[PDB]
Amino acid sequence: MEAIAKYDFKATADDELSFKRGDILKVLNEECDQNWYKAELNGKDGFIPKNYIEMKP
């Protein structure tokens, strides 16, 4: 699936990865959390918040 960064984001921990308002993310895993997504960016893979992005099937 596709993901779209809506706001700027700077990780908080090792299991999270950054982006900047506009990144096109690769939606890999998703443990049905209702607050986060596991996606690929910039040569890394990590958690990103749902309210900071928008999904696009």
Partner: peptide, 10 residues
């Protein structure tokens, strides 16, 4: 001003 981030780990 972006949203309040969610508490991780549910």
């Amino acid at each position: 001003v972006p949203p309040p981030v969610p508490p991780r780990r549910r």
